Amino acid sequence: KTLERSVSVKGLSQKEVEADTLILPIKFTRSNNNLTNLYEELEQDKENIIKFLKEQGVKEDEINYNSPNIIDRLSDPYSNDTQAAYRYIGTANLLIYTQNVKLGKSILENISSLAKFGIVTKIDDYDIEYLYTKLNEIKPQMIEEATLNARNAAIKLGKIKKASQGQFSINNRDKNTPYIKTIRVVSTIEYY
């Protein structure tokens, strides 16, 4: 009348963890007819941004800086046209790489204070990274926990028919907490 019976349980491993890496790129841009003057204002912009980051808790060894990217437009602020401008435009990037992930919130709310110096900072939310770089290291024990939780629900009794493993998910806790990640895995076990 019946040929087999099997029971299926899904085991859940879930953990909140704190991101260990914050990558925060701060771009700032200037224009000038004289290229030497563009570099001097960028360099002065860079010094003021660094001072604000150090006040915020960032250390010097967490700040990285590439050569500014300079575009020659060959324009002039005298030529009567609808598209006249300064000849050169330069954009620079101060790239923060730190394990002090809780610094990011305060940096992003106060960076407007640099408007004083005439600094134009652009920070793209898409390129702000809060990572838990230990993610792959923690997977084996969470897989065991899920598989184990599945077995113990089955207790509450033959061999194992099928074993499957979902992929890990990793989500921010709240919107206000990007430096805290929720990590989940589900292990599915079917017994006879």
Side-chain angles (χ1 to χ4, degrees), residues 3-43 45-50 52-58 61-72 74-79 84-104 106-115 117-121 123-124 128-155 158 160-161 163-174 176-183 185-192:
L3 277 200
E4 79 152 54
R5 283 133 81 244
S6 75
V7 72
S8 270
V9 288
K10 286 176 185 258
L12 165 67
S13 181
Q14 187 168 323
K15 221 159 241 41
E16 270 190 25
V17 295
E18 185 177 282
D20 49 53
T21 302
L22 162 60
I23 304 179
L24 192 43
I26 308 183
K27 301 144 166 195
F28 57 108
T29 175
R30 292 278 217 192
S31 293
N32 202 294
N33 246 41
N34 180 288
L35 181 62
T36 301
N37 295 158
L38 205 171
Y39 278 107
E40 289 171 345
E41 302 189 341
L42 276 182
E43 185 69 26
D45 283 4
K46 179 195 116 172
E47 287 317 309
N48 287 321
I49 300 174
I50 286 173
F52 156 83
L53 294 186
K54 289 189 180 185
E55 287 164 30
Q56 284 296 150
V58 187
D61 291 327
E62 300 165 310
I63 303 174
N64 310 271
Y65 186 71
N66 286 20
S67 300
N69 309 111
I70 304 299
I71 299 181
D72 191 337
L74 299 134
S75 59
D76 195 73
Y78 167 93
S79 136
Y86 290 108
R87 165 169 190 176
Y88 306 102
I89 181 162
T91 302
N93 186 4
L94 281 162
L95 177 68
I96 305 176
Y97 193 99
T98 174
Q99 72 173 33
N100 274 5
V101 297
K102 283 168 102 160
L103 292 184
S106 173
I107 291 164
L108 293 184
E109 276 149 15
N110 304 326
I111 199 132
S112 44
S113 80
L114 297 183
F117 309 109
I119 295 173
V120 183
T121 44
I123 301 189
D124 291 307
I128 303 173
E129 306 291 316
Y130 287 89
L131 309 169
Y132 184 72
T133 57
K134 280 168 274 113
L135 166 68
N136 288 344
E137 302 173 15
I138 204 181
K139 284 187 171 176
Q141 77 188 66
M142 293 184 66
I143 292 165
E144 277 188 8
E145 187 197 3
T147 297
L148 176 65
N149 278 202
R151 172 152 96 260
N152 288 335
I155 267 65
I160 287 186
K161 187 181 190 210
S164 83
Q165 223 160 97
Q167 288 70 42
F168 274 77
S169 66
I170 165 152
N171 285 269
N172 294 319
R173 208 184 60 176
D174 343 291
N176 302 117
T177 327
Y179 63 92
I180 288 183
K181 304 306 199 204
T182 301
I183 301 188
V185 69
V186 181
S187 208
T188 298
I189 297 292
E190 183 180 358
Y191 294 95
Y192 284 108

Short mmCIF file of all heavy atoms in Angstrom, two decimals, residues 3-34:
data_model
loop_
_atom_site.label_atom_id
_atom_site.label_comp_id
_atom_site.label_asym_id
_atom_site.label_seq_id
_atom_site.Cartn_x
_atom_site.Cartn_y
_atom_site.Cartn_z
N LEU A 3 5.34 2.39 -0.16
CA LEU A 3 6.65 1.83 -0.46
C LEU A 3 7.81 2.47 0.29
O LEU A 3 8.88 1.86 0.34
CB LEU A 3 6.94 1.92 -1.97
CG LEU A 3 6.33 0.78 -2.78
CD1 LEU A 3 7.03 0.67 -4.12
CD2 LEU A 3 6.40 -0.53 -2.01
N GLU A 4 7.63 3.65 0.86
CA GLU A 4 8.64 4.25 1.72
C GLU A 4 8.04 5.48 2.39
O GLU A 4 7.03 6.02 1.94
CB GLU A 4 9.91 4.64 0.96
CG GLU A 4 9.80 5.93 0.17
CD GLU A 4 11.13 6.66 0.00
OE1 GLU A 4 12.10 6.04 -0.49
OE2 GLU A 4 11.21 7.86 0.35
N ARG A 5 8.70 5.92 3.47
CA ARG A 5 8.35 7.15 4.16
C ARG A 5 9.64 7.89 4.47
O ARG A 5 10.61 7.29 4.93
CB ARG A 5 7.57 6.88 5.45
CG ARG A 5 6.12 6.54 5.21
CD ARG A 5 5.68 5.33 6.01
NE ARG A 5 5.36 5.65 7.40
CZ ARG A 5 6.03 5.17 8.45
NH1 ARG A 5 7.06 4.35 8.27
NH2 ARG A 5 5.66 5.51 9.68
N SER A 6 9.64 9.20 4.23
CA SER A 6 10.81 10.00 4.51
C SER A 6 10.39 11.31 5.16
O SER A 6 9.29 11.82 4.92
CB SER A 6 11.63 10.27 3.23
OG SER A 6 11.02 11.23 2.41
N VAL A 7 11.27 11.84 6.00
CA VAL A 7 11.04 13.10 6.71
C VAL A 7 12.11 14.09 6.29
O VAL A 7 13.29 13.73 6.14
CB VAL A 7 11.04 12.91 8.25
CG1 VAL A 7 12.45 12.63 8.79
CG2 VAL A 7 10.46 14.13 8.92
N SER A 8 11.71 15.34 6.09
CA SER A 8 12.62 16.40 5.67
C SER A 8 12.59 17.53 6.68
O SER A 8 11.52 17.99 7.08
CB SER A 8 12.25 16.93 4.28
OG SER A 8 12.91 16.21 3.27
N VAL A 9 13.78 17.97 7.08
CA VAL A 9 13.92 19.09 8.00
C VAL A 9 14.92 20.08 7.40
O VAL A 9 15.90 19.68 6.77
CB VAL A 9 14.39 18.63 9.39
CG1 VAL A 9 13.26 17.91 10.09
CG2 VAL A 9 15.56 17.69 9.24
N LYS A 10 14.65 21.36 7.60
CA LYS A 10 15.58 22.41 7.22
C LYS A 10 16.21 22.98 8.48
O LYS A 10 15.49 23.35 9.42
CB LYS A 10 14.88 23.49 6.39
CG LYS A 10 14.58 23.02 4.98
CD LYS A 10 13.79 24.02 4.18
CE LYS A 10 13.42 23.45 2.81
NZ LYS A 10 14.30 23.96 1.72
N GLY A 11 17.54 22.99 8.53
CA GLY A 11 18.27 23.53 9.66
C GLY A 11 18.83 24.90 9.32
O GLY A 11 19.34 25.12 8.22
N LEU A 12 18.72 25.82 10.27
CA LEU A 12 19.11 27.21 10.08
C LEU A 12 20.30 27.54 10.95
O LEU A 12 20.28 27.31 12.17
CB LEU A 12 17.95 28.16 10.38
CG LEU A 12 18.36 29.63 10.56
CD1 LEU A 12 18.88 30.23 9.25
CD2 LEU A 12 17.22 30.45 11.13
N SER A 13 21.34 28.09 10.33
CA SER A 13 22.44 28.75 11.03
C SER A 13 22.37 30.24 10.70
O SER A 13 22.37 30.62 9.53
CB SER A 13 23.79 28.18 10.62
OG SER A 13 24.84 28.81 11.33
N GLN A 14 22.29 31.07 11.74
CA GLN A 14 22.22 32.51 11.56
C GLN A 14 23.10 33.19 12.59
O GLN A 14 23.14 32.78 13.76
CB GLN A 14 20.78 33.01 11.65
CG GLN A 14 20.61 34.48 11.31
CD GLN A 14 19.16 34.85 11.13
OE1 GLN A 14 18.37 34.07 10.59
NE2 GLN A 14 18.80 36.05 11.57
N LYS A 15 23.80 34.23 12.16
CA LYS A 15 24.82 34.88 12.96
C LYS A 15 24.87 36.34 12.54
O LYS A 15 24.84 36.64 11.34
CB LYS A 15 26.18 34.21 12.75
CG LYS A 15 27.04 34.02 14.00
CD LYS A 15 28.09 32.92 13.77
CE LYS A 15 27.92 31.75 14.74
NZ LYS A 15 26.48 31.39 14.96
N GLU A 16 24.90 37.24 13.52
CA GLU A 16 25.24 38.63 13.27
C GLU A 16 26.72 38.82 13.53
O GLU A 16 27.25 38.32 14.53
CB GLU A 16 24.43 39.57 14.17
CG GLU A 16 23.11 40.04 13.59
CD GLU A 16 22.47 41.14 14.42
OE1 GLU A 16 23.21 41.86 15.14
OE2 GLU A 16 21.24 41.29 14.36
N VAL A 17 27.41 39.50 12.61
CA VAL A 17 28.84 39.75 12.72
C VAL A 17 29.12 41.20 12.35
O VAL A 17 28.32 41.86 11.69
CB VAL A 17 29.69 38.81 11.83
CG1 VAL A 17 29.55 37.38 12.29
CG2 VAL A 17 29.28 38.98 10.35
N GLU A 18 30.28 41.68 12.77
CA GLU A 18 30.71 43.04 12.50
C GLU A 18 31.69 43.02 11.33
O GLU A 18 32.70 42.30 11.38
CB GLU A 18 31.36 43.67 13.73
CG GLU A 18 31.72 45.13 13.52
CD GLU A 18 32.29 45.78 14.77
OE1 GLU A 18 31.50 46.12 15.68
OE2 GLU A 18 33.53 45.95 14.83
N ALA A 19 31.39 43.80 10.30
CA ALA A 19 32.31 43.96 9.18
C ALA A 19 33.70 44.35 9.69
O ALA A 19 33.84 45.09 10.65
CB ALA A 19 31.79 45.03 8.22
N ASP A 20 34.73 43.81 9.03
CA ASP A 20 36.11 44.10 9.38
C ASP A 20 36.79 45.04 8.40
O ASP A 20 37.96 45.39 8.61
CB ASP A 20 36.93 42.81 9.48
CG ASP A 20 36.73 41.90 8.27
OD1 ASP A 20 36.90 42.36 7.13
OD2 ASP A 20 36.41 40.71 8.48
N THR A 21 36.12 45.43 7.32
CA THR A 21 36.74 46.25 6.30
C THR A 21 35.76 47.32 5.84
O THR A 21 34.62 47.02 5.49
CB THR A 21 37.19 45.41 5.09
OG1 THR A 21 38.10 44.39 5.52
CG2 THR A 21 37.88 46.28 4.06
N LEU A 22 36.22 48.57 5.87
CA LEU A 22 35.50 49.71 5.30
C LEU A 22 36.36 50.32 4.21
O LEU A 22 37.51 50.69 4.47
CB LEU A 22 35.16 50.74 6.39
CG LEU A 22 34.79 52.16 5.97
CD1 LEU A 22 33.56 52.19 5.08
CD2 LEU A 22 34.57 53.01 7.22
N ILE A 23 35.82 50.40 3.00
CA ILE A 23 36.48 51.04 1.87
C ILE A 23 35.67 52.28 1.52
O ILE A 23 34.50 52.18 1.13
CB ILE A 23 36.59 50.10 0.66
CG1 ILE A 23 37.31 48.80 1.05
CG2 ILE A 23 37.33 50.78 -0.49
CD1 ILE A 23 37.44 47.81 -0.10
N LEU A 24 36.28 53.46 1.68
CA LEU A 24 35.56 54.72 1.57
C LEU A 24 36.29 55.67 0.63
O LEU A 24 37.30 56.29 1.02
CB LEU A 24 35.38 55.35 2.95
CG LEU A 24 34.42 56.53 3.06
CD1 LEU A 24 33.15 56.27 2.27
CD2 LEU A 24 34.10 56.79 4.52
N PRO A 25 35.84 55.79 -0.62
CA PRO A 25 36.52 56.69 -1.56
C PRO A 25 35.94 58.10 -1.55
O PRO A 25 34.73 58.29 -1.75
CB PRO A 25 36.30 56.01 -2.92
CG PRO A 25 35.32 54.84 -2.66
CD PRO A 25 34.78 55.00 -1.27
N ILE A 26 36.79 59.09 -1.32
CA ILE A 26 36.41 60.49 -1.31
C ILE A 26 37.05 61.16 -2.52
O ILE A 26 38.27 61.36 -2.55
CB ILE A 26 36.83 61.19 -0.01
CG1 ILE A 26 36.33 60.41 1.20
CG2 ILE A 26 36.31 62.63 0.01
CD1 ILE A 26 36.65 61.07 2.52
N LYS A 27 36.24 61.50 -3.52
CA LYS A 27 36.72 62.23 -4.68
C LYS A 27 36.53 63.73 -4.45
O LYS A 27 35.54 64.16 -3.85
CB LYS A 27 35.98 61.81 -5.94
CG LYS A 27 36.11 60.33 -6.30
CD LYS A 27 34.81 59.81 -6.90
CE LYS A 27 34.97 58.46 -7.59
NZ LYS A 27 33.80 58.16 -8.48
N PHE A 28 37.50 64.52 -4.91
CA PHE A 28 37.36 65.97 -4.91
C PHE A 28 37.95 66.53 -6.19
O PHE A 28 38.92 65.99 -6.74
CB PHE A 28 38.01 66.60 -3.66
CG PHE A 28 39.47 66.28 -3.48
CD1 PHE A 28 40.44 67.26 -3.71
CD2 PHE A 28 39.88 65.04 -3.04
CE1 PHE A 28 41.78 66.98 -3.52
CE2 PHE A 28 41.22 64.76 -2.85
CZ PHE A 28 42.17 65.73 -3.08
N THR A 29 37.34 67.60 -6.68
CA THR A 29 37.59 68.08 -8.03
C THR A 29 37.78 69.59 -8.02
O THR A 29 37.22 70.30 -7.18
CB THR A 29 36.43 67.68 -8.96
OG1 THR A 29 36.63 68.26 -10.26
CG2 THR A 29 35.10 68.15 -8.39
N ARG A 30 38.60 70.07 -8.95
CA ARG A 30 38.86 71.50 -9.10
C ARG A 30 39.07 71.80 -10.58
O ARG A 30 39.40 70.92 -11.37
CB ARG A 30 40.09 71.95 -8.30
CG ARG A 30 39.94 71.91 -6.78
CD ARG A 30 39.21 73.13 -6.25
NE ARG A 30 39.77 73.56 -4.97
CZ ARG A 30 39.20 74.45 -4.16
NH1 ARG A 30 38.05 75.01 -4.50
NH2 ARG A 30 39.79 74.78 -3.02
N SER A 31 38.86 73.06 -10.93
CA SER A 31 39.11 73.57 -12.27
C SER A 31 39.95 74.83 -12.17
O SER A 31 39.87 75.57 -11.18
CB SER A 31 37.81 73.88 -13.03
OG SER A 31 37.10 72.69 -13.30
N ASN A 32 40.74 75.09 -13.21
CA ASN A 32 41.64 76.23 -13.20
C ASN A 32 42.16 76.44 -14.61
O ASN A 32 42.29 75.48 -15.38
CB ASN A 32 42.81 76.02 -12.23
CG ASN A 32 43.45 77.32 -11.79
OD1 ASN A 32 44.06 78.03 -12.60
ND2 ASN A 32 43.35 77.63 -10.50
N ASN A 33 42.44 77.70 -14.95
CA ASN A 33 43.07 77.97 -16.23
C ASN A 33 44.56 77.67 -16.21
O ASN A 33 45.14 77.35 -17.25
CB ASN A 33 42.84 79.43 -16.64
CG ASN A 33 41.99 79.55 -17.88
OD1 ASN A 33 41.01 78.82 -18.04
ND2 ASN A 33 42.36 80.46 -18.78
N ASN A 34 45.18 77.76 -15.04
CA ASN A 34 46.60 77.48 -14.87
C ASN A 34 46.75 76.12 -14.21
O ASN A 34 46.21 75.89 -13.12
CB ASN A 34 47.27 78.58 -14.05
CG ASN A 34 48.75 78.34 -13.84
OD1 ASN A 34 49.15 77.46 -13.08
ND2 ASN A 34 49.58 79.14 -14.50
#
